[PDB]
Subunit: 142 residues, 2 copies
């Protein structure tokens, strides 16, 4: 497959981001979150109870990775993946952006989003890429 | 399944760690690496060319996650997973621990290890847990 269409198929199939966040003193945390993406950036809906949400609140930098499953990988030392760093911003509840992304998320993930989007500790973060994109295992590399 | 056997099964079946590292100014990076574990800690063999290896060298804190695959998860918003923070240290090439761990890795991962263990950019890091372990999706929770 050609590079560009393979990237597209991958972004459409993968439902989760792996995230590296940091607290105010720069202690690292790794976590994951289901996501949707659109013209405004990548969006995750996560719990303030968990560290990654409290981290993105105080220190709005994230390293993001979208990666194929261990069991799907031809080569474990070369998992097909897309990686990029981003700047995090919280999305105001019930704002126009909020309603759009929640809608999108419901469409991708279904009923579950109904409950989650009601809970006060669940915050919506917009993540916007800034320093490039790394792509491994696509096109000529597949 | 009971908690303890379910954890045992997971660590045996899961072959990579997802890593959150930080550079000298505390900027996050997300990555992954095949691992082995033994009584000396968790071990990953990674390239100094890549950011995570240079991060671990200069700022040796890391957040580690072992996580079930996306396509296998019953619920995407509750992927079964183990998470822990750790301290990293570099293992001296051709030292006793190096030879011990390379043999273990070759056993888990096969001949690929023969090549990587000979590339000078590939370094062996020991990751040791310092602040307990978070267990999500096991035993009574399953």
């Amino acid at each position: 497959m050609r590079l560009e269409p393979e990237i597209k198929e991958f972004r459409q199939e993968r439902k989760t981001l792996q995230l590296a966040t940091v607290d105010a003193q720069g202690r690292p945390n790794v976590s994951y979150a289901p996501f949707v993406q659109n013209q405004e950036g990548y969006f995750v809906l996560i719990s303030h109870i968990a560290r990654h949400a409290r981290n993105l609140e105080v220190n709005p930098q994230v390293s993001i990775m979208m990666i194929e499953d261990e069991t799907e990988a031809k080569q474990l030392f070369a998992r097909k993946r897309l990686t990029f760093d981003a700047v995090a911003s919280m999305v105001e509840r019930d704002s126009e952006l909020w309603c759009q992304v929640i809608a999108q998320m419901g469409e991708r993930f279904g009923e579950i989003i109904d409950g989650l989007s009601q809970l006060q500790d669940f915050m919506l973060f917009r993540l916007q890429p800034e320093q490039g994109l790394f792509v491994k295992g696509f096109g000529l590399e597949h």
